[PDB]
Amino acid sequence: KALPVLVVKLTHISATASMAVPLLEFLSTLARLPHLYRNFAAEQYASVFAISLPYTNPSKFNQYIVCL
Amino acid sequence: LDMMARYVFSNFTAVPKRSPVGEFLLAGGRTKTWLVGNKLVTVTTSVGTGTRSLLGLNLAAYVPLLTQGWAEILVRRPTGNTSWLMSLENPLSPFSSDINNMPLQELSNALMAAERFKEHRDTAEKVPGINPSFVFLQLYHSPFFGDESNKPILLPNESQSFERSVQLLDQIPSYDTHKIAVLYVGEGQSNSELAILSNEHGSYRYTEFLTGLGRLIELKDCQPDKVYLGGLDVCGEDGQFTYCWHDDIMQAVFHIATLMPTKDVDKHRCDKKRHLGNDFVSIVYNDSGEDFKLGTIKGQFNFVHVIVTPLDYECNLVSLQCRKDMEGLVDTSVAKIVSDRNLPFVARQMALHANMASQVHHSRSNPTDIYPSKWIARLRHIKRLRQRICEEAAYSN
Amino acid sequence: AHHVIAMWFIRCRLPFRKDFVPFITKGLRSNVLLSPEKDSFRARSDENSVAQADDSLKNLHLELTETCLDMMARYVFSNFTAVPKRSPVGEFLLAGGRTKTWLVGNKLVTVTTSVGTGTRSLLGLNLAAYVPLLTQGWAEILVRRPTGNTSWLMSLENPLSPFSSDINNMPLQELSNALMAAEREKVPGINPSFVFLQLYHSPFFGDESNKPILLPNESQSFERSVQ
Amino acid sequence: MEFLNRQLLVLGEVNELYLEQLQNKHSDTTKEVEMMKAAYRKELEKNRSH
Amino acid sequence: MEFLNRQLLVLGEVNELYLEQLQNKHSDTTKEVEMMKAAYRKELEKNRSH
């Protein structure tokens, strides 16, 4: 019940290296828990990609961060 | 982008399963492969292959007429292979086929004209079979190409050193492959490399932690190409069973010391160490009541350890120890306390992220290696194959 | 002259046929050069009226050249008819199917995927929610080109993802028993853009003119234009 | 004949789906294993307390 | 149509075989159930000896 609001709230976090590993670990552990996001609407998924897309940038983020 | 183009409207696996009848009809078929951008479009067409026995059937004419529209288009891409068995709706032209005899029995058997079906029982200059370039040109040909970015490049069909390259691409998986060691440390084994590898059965909590790591795969019945065994012998040198953890994007396999047999011949348990010591990451089920130290298993690799310290009251403490060069990628300050019922999830996924970090670090110290991200490994293979063809063609002019 | 070339290219013996592509293409190219032109695909295998006359003449040059090349590509390697006919099993699969059309250069690629219409009629129709999954791998791709239509009924050989899709919950006992006993993206069936992207998608192009153009599927006009 | 052909095609697809379920679906009847896990864990708690 | 009937009876037998197998997929768990039993037995024996 906290997830639909939670994923939105994580988008408000600025993309910094100190946050890259926790956010991506959270999203990757969440992805492997299908019973949690079974009722995700489009806004929730859009939040997920909004959190993880900034971390796909090797010009700013470590290669492990980018691969993850 | 290739993944998005692959999964936006589908959830089909990254590896085709050619049907028994497809193999029968396309065995020894006429095949050609094109680079079309960073994709290998392969078309194969049927050479007949004695279809008369499959269908149980002018006698020398209607079967070859029926088969030569059957084809397979297989697109190898950075993210996987897609293929469709194909069958032309275009009949052979009565005005332009061979002028010896043109019976209408093809139309008489129109319902069988696509008798390739998903499941079947198949048995108790003059070269036949349409050129795969018919399917290719009909699908892909147009004037005014992007001169070098988009223009199709036929892989030299004659030189085996390129079929070898495509076979290498098929051996590069369409999913990241992770091999994770899992060790049991009993009482007093906190510093004994030999005792750790010599364990044949762990605590009950350890066994329940094993049962959650993924599906049990009986190695004897697992195909190495399809189910990632990481190096374990199919024939049982390394035990009847092991656990593996599958996803569309990745396959992780657990090399579990206790499941590997201990033979009297194997003194230092090198039959086990050959797997556990060559893995980047080990989940150490530290039942020794004493701080396990990284590097206790002396071998190279073993960059990160996921130390599972079982606590009282059905819970565990999971932490990471890593080599001083890996410490920039892996956070050793992790002390994730997790209950037993979710421990084989948390330690498993920590092992995955530790392994990804380790595979990336290994590339930094070993740049020439196949890239850890198997999608990028496929893409770099496709790029390198395309550039190699350009060089060899240039050397041929 | 183009009728003569087409007649001979289509009727001359198939082995020689590829070797005439470069000669015909070089001749056509030389004609255009008197007023990315090459496209030799064998490598892959008042005075205002005068101005309009010249502009249309150059365009006619290219239309003749492009139709000759399309004929050559169509017939260099086969002598199948320029019209396809969907087999009875093809109609059983794709009748009422899910279809899209793309203008990919000067050709219309069309993909039609199998909604389980025929499967429903077979079973005589919870099973109804799964009968489209039972045949969603079958499709038809149909390339409309200046010189004819080519199409293949195609069956996807890839198993559905046991992780990220519904297979493990399909009612196979009921489905099998039903169709044996019988006698005689919420939309069902996979998006035809799956087949199109798996065949034709490229992450980069030389010019924006290379891109496929999707025909607006909700418009009567473009559907009538294809028809 | 056409009905038989259609039935054979759909049956072939059913069989392929059976094959992919058989090679990918997990084992059923997990309640016995759940109860064994619970009983073993409880008795282990008892013996470990002792 | 004789060929179609022959392929149909063959694939009917194959479908029945797959159906029977999926009636008893539960047996795949015994491989790890034996591990659990062995570990429980070893724990009990070790604690009883202790």
The secondary structure element, H or E, covering residue B317 is strand B315-322
Q: Least CB-CB distance to E35: which of B119, B121, B210?
A: B210
Which parts of C33-116 fold into alpha helices (H)?
Answer: 47-75, 88-94
Q: Is D44 on the interface with C (CB under 8 A)?
A: no
DSSP-assigned beta bridge partners for residue B320 = B306
Strand blocks (E) in D1-50: none
Interface of E with D in 11-50 (CB under 8 A): 11-12, 14-15, 18-19, 21-22, 25-29, 33, 36-37, 40, 43-44, 47-48
The secondary structure element, H or E, covering residue B271 is helix B270-276
Measured between beta carbons, which residues in chain B are less than 8 angstroms from residue C203? 1-2, 37-38
Amino acid found at C117: T
Tell me the structure's resolution in angstroms, rounded to a single decimal: 2.9
**Rounded CA separation B387/B394 (Å):** 11
**Rounded CA separation B211/B207 (Å):** 6
Which residues, 6 or more positions from B104, have their beta carbon under 8 angstroms from its beta carbon?
none
Contact between B219 and B240 under an 8 Å Cβ cutoff? The reply is yes
Residue in C closest to E12 by C-alpha: C180
Interface of D with B in 3-22 (CB under 8 A): 5, 8-9, 11-13, 15-16, 19-20
Q: In what order do the strands lie in the sheet with C98-103?
A: B153-154, B30-35, B40-45, B70-77, B80-88, C148-156, C138-145, C108-113, C98-103, C213-214
DSSP letter (8 states) at residue B220? G
> How many inter-chain contacts (B to D, CB under 8 Å) are there?
29
**Rounded CA separation B331/B353 (Å):** 11
Any idea which residue has 């004209």 for tokens? B113
Which approach determined this entry? cryo-EM
Q: Is B216 on the interface with E (CB under 8 A)?
A: yes
- Distance to chain B for E20, nearest Cα, Å: 18
| Plot region of B262 (φ>0 → left; ψ -120 to 50 → alpha; else → beta) | beta
Q: At what angle do helices D31-49 and B204-211 cross, to 10 degrees?
A: 150
Interface of C with B in 207-226 (CB under 8 A): 207, 209-210
| Paired tokens of B33 | 């492969």
**Rounded CA separation B11/C166 (Å):** 9
What one-character-per-residue DSSP string does B75-141 give?
EEETTEEEEEEEEESPPBPTTTS-SS---THHHHTTTGGG---SS---------S--HHHHHHHHH-
Longest dimension (CA), chain E: 75
**Rounded CA separation B389/B386 (Å):** 5
Q: Least CB-CB distance to A68: which of B345, B346, B353?
A: B353
- Closest Cα partner for C120 from E4, D10, B111? D10
Amino acid found at B40: L
Parallel, antiparallel or unpaired: strands B250-256 and B281-286 = unpaired
